Amino acid sequence: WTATSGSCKGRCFELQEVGPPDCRCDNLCKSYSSCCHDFDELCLKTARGWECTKDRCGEVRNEENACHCSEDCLSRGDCCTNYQVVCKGESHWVDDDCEEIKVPECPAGFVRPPLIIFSVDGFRASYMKKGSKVMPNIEKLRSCGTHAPYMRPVYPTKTFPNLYTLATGLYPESHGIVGNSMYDPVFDASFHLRGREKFNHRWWGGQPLWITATKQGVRAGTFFWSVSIPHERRILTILQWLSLPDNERPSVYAFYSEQPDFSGHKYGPFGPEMTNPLREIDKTVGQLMDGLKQLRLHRCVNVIFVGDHGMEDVTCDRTEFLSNYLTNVDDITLVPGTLGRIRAKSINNSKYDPKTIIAALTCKKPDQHFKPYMKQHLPKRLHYANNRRIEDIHLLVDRRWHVARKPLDVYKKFFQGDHGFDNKVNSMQTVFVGYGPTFKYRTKVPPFENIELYNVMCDLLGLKPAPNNGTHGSLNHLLRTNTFRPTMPDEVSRPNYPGIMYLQSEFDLGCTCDDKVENKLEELNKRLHTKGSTKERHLLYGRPAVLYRTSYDILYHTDFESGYSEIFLMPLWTSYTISKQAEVSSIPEHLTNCVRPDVRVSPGFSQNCLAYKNDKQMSYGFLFPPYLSSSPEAKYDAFLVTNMVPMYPAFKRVWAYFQRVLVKKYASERNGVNVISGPIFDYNYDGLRDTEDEIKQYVEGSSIPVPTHYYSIITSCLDFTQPADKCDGPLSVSSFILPHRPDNDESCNSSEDESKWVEELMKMHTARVRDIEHLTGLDFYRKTSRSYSEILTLKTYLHTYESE
Numbered sequence: 140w141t142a143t144s145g146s147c148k149g150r151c152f153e154l155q156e157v158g159p160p161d162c163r164c165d166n167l168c169k170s171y172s173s174c175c176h177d178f179d180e181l182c183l184k185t186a187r188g189w190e191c192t193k194d195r196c197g198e199v200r201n202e203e204n205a206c207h208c209s210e211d212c213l214s215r216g217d218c219c220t221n222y223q224v225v226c227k228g229e230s231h232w233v234d235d236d237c238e239e240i241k242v243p244e245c246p247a248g249f250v251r252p253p254l255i256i257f258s259v260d261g262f263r264a265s266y267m268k269k270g271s272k273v274m275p276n277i278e279k280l281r282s283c284g285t286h287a288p289y290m291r292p293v294y295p296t297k298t299f300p301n302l303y304t305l306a307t308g309l310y311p312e313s314h315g316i317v318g319n320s321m322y323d324p325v326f327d328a329s330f331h332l333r334g335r336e337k338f339n340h341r342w343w344g345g346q347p348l349w350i351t352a353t354k355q356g357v358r359a360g361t362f363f364w365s366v367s368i369p370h371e372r373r374i375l376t377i378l379q380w381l382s383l384p385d386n387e388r389p390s391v392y393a394f395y396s397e398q399p400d401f402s403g404h405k406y407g408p409f410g411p412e413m414t415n416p417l418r419e420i421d422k423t424v425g426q427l428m429d430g431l432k433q434l435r436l437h438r439c440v441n442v443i444f445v446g447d448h449g450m451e452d453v454t455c456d457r458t459e460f461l462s463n464y465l466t467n468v469d470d471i472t473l474v475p476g477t478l479g480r481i482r483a484k485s486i487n488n489s490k491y492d493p494k495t496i497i498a499a500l501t502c503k504k505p506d507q508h509f510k511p512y513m514k515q516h517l518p519k520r521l522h523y524a525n526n527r528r529i530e531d532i533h534l535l536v537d538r539r540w541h542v543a544r545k546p547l548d549v550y551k552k553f554f555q556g557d558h559g560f561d562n563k564v565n566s567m568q569t570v571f572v573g574y575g576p577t578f579k580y581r582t583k584v585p586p587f588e589n590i591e592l593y594n595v596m597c598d599l600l601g602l603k604p605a606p607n608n609g610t611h612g613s614l615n616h617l618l619r620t621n622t623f624r625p626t627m628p629d630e631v632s633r634p635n636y637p638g639i640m641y642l643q644s645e646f647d648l649g650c651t652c653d654d655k656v657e658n659k660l661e662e663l664n665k666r667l668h669t670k671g672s673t674k675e676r677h678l679l680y681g682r683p684a685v686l687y688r689t690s691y692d693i694l695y696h697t698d699f700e701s702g703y704s705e706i707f708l709m710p711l712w713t714s715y716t717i718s719k720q721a722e723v724s725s726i727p728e729h730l731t732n733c734v735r736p737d738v739r740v741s742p743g744f745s746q747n748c749l750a751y752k753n754d755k756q757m758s759y760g761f762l763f764p765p766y767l768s769s770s771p772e773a774k775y776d777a778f779l780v781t782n783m784v785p786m787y788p789a790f791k792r793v794w795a796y797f798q799r800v801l802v803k804k805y806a807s808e809r810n811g812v813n814v815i816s817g818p819i820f821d822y823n824y825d826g827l828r829d830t831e832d833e834i835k836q837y838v839e840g841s842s843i844p845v846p847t848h849y850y851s852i853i854t855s856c857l858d859f860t861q862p863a864d865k866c867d868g869p870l871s872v873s874s875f876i877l878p879h880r881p882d883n884d885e886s887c888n889s890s891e892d893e894s895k896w897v898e899e900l901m902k903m904h905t906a907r908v909r910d911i912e913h914l915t916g917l918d919f920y921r922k923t924s925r926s927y928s929e930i931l932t933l934k935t936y937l938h939t940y941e942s943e
């Protein structure tokens with residue numbers, strides 16, 4: 140109940156919402172149907188439209204008007220945005236030459252440059268080039284300020300998850316807005332874009348920027364807008380708030396546009412009907428900039444022009460129906476469209492079984508346009524599993540397609556565009572431009588992820604960010620000033636450096652090796668290798684730091700270095716360099732089943748071969764590949780028990796092809812590569828290193844833990860004219876986190892030769908170095924010649940494998 144018979148007189152667009160049942164006059168009152176009776180008359184004036192004209196100049200103030208052209212309007216802060224142009228002979232902001240903003244040029248009383256975030260729904264990255272002739276204000280922001288060619292949204296590429304990620308710096312699994320529609324089984328409640336459940340604060344986790352600001356004494360209202368307030372009124376409201384007295388004036392403002400998304404769903408991303416919405420958004424940017432110019436704020440405020448996601452061609456004929464795969468379709472609930480989420484229709488149905496649903500949806504049709512996953516099996520780069528609102532069964536939908544439960548859902552529900560797909564898909568990429576005194580001038584920056592922007596907005600406002608998933612400092616290169624200068628994290632565990640401490644006969648591991656193969660010259664040589672004489676070749680960027688408490692040993696060898704965990708009985712990391720000239724060899728016949736005790740490491744802290752013999756499901760692989768040994772003699776080191784890791788035979792197919800074929804291909808293409816590989820344990824799918832007591836699976840009868848994934852980080856010189864091991868400047872990286880699965884059901888073509896499917900798998904599981912850091916508690920690139928912020932940028936890089 141609202142007592143709507145209070146009044147908005149002197150209260151229009153108040154920033155502090157008032158409490159029920161009192162009537163409201165803030166920018167969200169319409170959403171709650173709680174505005175006072177006179178809100179439209181007083182706060183939504185439209186008389187005489189939005190523009191000054193020659194005849195209005197110097198008019199007697201008429202309080203009925205939408206905006207003013209009387210002489211007093213500048214001091215009232217309520218001129219139409221083109222007032223000075225029409226009436227005072229000024230130019231539009233867009234017609235002024237760009238001039239570098241070296242310092243804030245702000246009116247007296249301004250404590251800091253204000254931040255204005257201008258969010259555009261569905262603004263696909265390629266609009267910035269393709270629409271540039273019809274968007275001159277946006278083109279001036281872009282060309283004169285700091286821009287990226289695109290910005291990567293989060294998955295799913297839907298509105299609410301991305302806008303709330305922009306506000307919090309958090310992945311959707313952590314802030315809790317995991318889709319535009321959600322069911323929370325603990326609350327037993329549902330969230331939808333339409334309706335009121337979404338007003339309940341219990342859905343919205345993390346700390347959005349307006350709360351971060353408010354807590355730290357910086358004034359800031361929410362970034363939401365009632366859809367029915369026209370854009371011209373939103374702009375005039377912002378300009379009015381900027382005219383408040385110093386003690387009352389916010390420091391952060393948000394404008395939101397529902398375009399071009401609204402039209403893009405109707406017409407497709409490049410429908411001829413799309414030109415006019417792009418023109419109208421550009422006109423709104425022009426109103427804002429002219430308005431700022433009038434207030435002498437156009438060289439004071441920092442403006443961010445940012446989108447939530449792009450838009451793809453999608454029509455209802457490209458729909459897959461679950462009723463064509465499942466006999467039991469009425470026993471499931473599907474959240475449909477550009478992603479699928481499946482759960483049981485009834486919690487009382489004891490015959491519901493996820494394994495049978497997954498199997499019925501796996502590789503059933505030749506050109507099947509979706510792929511089912513248990514959520515823990517989704518690519519780790521999506522960070523889309525650790526929330527009870529995310530159903531266990533997920534469908535990754537191909538770009539341009541939908542999935543639905545039954546055909547009647549699609550015709551008893553027009554459209555030509557949609558979004559929501561994998562966030563690496565080119566059509567889903569969106570936009571970032573920063574313009575103002577704190578951003579750089581005429582500067583292009585590489586693409587980056589939208590999770591990084593919260594920290595930068597905190598930096599722009601002098602705020603300490605709440606804990607988030609950005610890597611603070613990784614976007615320092617966007618900024619002229621206010622950079623954040625992080626220190627590297629402190630190493631928590633220092634390594635042991637064991638020498639030869641055990642005799643062969645102390646081992647009873649059930650292993651064998653034909654290595655009894657028969658010199659002062661070359662014996663000192665082998666000793667030096669074990670002491671670390673080649674370490675500068677194979678550990679190019681320092682050893683990784685271990686950021687938690689544990690017991691581990693550094694082991695040196697001719698061809699590779701490793702950090703060996705006495706707790707997990709395997710390396711945490713193994714590092715090796717492969718030059719462009721390196722030669723690939725075979726595992727010799729006499730060494731096929733060779734495993735050798737490591738006399739530096741106790742039998743008690745070693746794996747054993749008998750466990751692998753007994754475990755009929757589990758085999759083993761090696762982290763440093765024997766195929767890339769530098770010599771027949773060095774090859775023996777590759778068969779050390781301390782280089783062994785547990786591997787399902789299905790996974791060994793993947794791993795062997797990567798090691799035998801792809802590493803050398805990369806070294807050939809990149810002029811040498813340095814590779815760091817290792818295991819990952821994430822049994823609770825939280826994206827974070829498991830402790831020993833979280834491990835759900837061991838090699839049968841043993842204490843050897845089974846990794847959930849295997850990673851590799853492959854580094855070389857950005858200037859590929861220099862070899863990876865003699866690189867003078869910036870680095871180039873690609874990484875992956877491959878799921879360690881006992882089948883290749885994910886790869887529908889896995890019956891074919893590995894050259895037809897393995898690299899496709901690896902691309903799907905591409906990762907940032909930062910993702911591996913979270914998953915391992917290791918910190919890489921500790922010893923380089925590069926600035927720490929540059930290294931943070933490198934750790935956030937994702938190699939996406941999309942075309943231009």
Ligand SMILES: *[C@@H]1O[C@H](CO)[C@@H](O[C@@H]2O[C@H](CO)[C@@H](O[C@@H]3O[C@H](CO[C@H]4O[C@H](CO)[C@@H](O)[C@H](O[C@H]5O[C@H](CO)[C@@H](O)[C@H](O)[C@@H]5O[C@H]5O[C@H](CO)[C@@H](O)[C@H](O)[C@@H]5O)[C@@H]4O)[C@@H](O)[C@H](O[C@H]4O[C@H](CO)[C@@H](O)[C@H](O)[C@@H]4O[C@H]4O[C@H](CO)[C@@H](O)[C@H](O)[C@@H]4O)[C@@H]3O)[C@H](O)[C@H]2NC(C)=O)[C@H](O)[C@H]1NC(C)=O
Nearest residue numbers: 312313314315343344345525526527606607608825826913
């Ligand atoms: C991305 O960045 C974020 C932000 O840094 C990272 O997330 C943090 O990760 C931490 C570890 O997972 C986690 O720390 C836990 O916090 C518990 C207190 O949590 C509440 O308070 C905080 C602070 O205000 C708040 O933010 C939380 O918000 C979550 O929960 C509400 C729902 O109530 C949601 O609205 C909100 O969206 C958010 O949900 C997300 O996080 C929770 C986990 O907290 C998930 O379950 C959700 O699915 C969702 O992802 C909370 O309101 C604290 O109690 C925990 O401590 C327990 O565990 C530690 C382990 O160190 C142990 O030492 C303690 O003893 C304790 O154990 C006891 O409880 C156990 C569980 O019941 C029990 O089993 C034991 O036996 C013990 O009794 C823990 O410290 C932190 O909350 C989140 N923060 C956020 C915002 O998500 C994230 O990791 C980053 N991602 C990557 C990939 O890097």
Ligand SMILES: O=C(Cn1cnc2ccc(N3CCN(C(=O)C4CCCC4)CC3)cc2c1=O)NCc1ccc(Cl)c(Cl)c1
Nearest residue numbers: 167170299302303306337338340343347362363364365395
């Ligand atoms: O603006 C709209 C549509 N719209 C319109 N009217 C609304 C009225 C109320 C509320 N609620 C206020 C109380 N509320 C909260 O206070 C929670 C959010 C932060 C912590 C508590 C829960 C949410 C949300 C909306 C809303 O979405 N869409 C654009 C947009 C802009 C910024 C962001 Cl971040 C997002 Cl996700 C979406």
Ligand SMILES: [Ca+2]
Nearest residue numbers: 260261298447
């Ligand atoms: Ca959107």
Ligand SMILES: [Ca+2]
Nearest residue numbers: 821827828829
């Ligand atoms: Ca974990």
Ligand code: NA
Nearest residue numbers: 751754755757
């Ligand atoms: Na076995």
Ligand code: NA
Nearest residue numbers: 883884886889
């Ligand atoms: Na397969």
Ligand SMILES: [Zn+2]
Nearest residue numbers: 261400404558
């Ligand atoms: Zn949309």
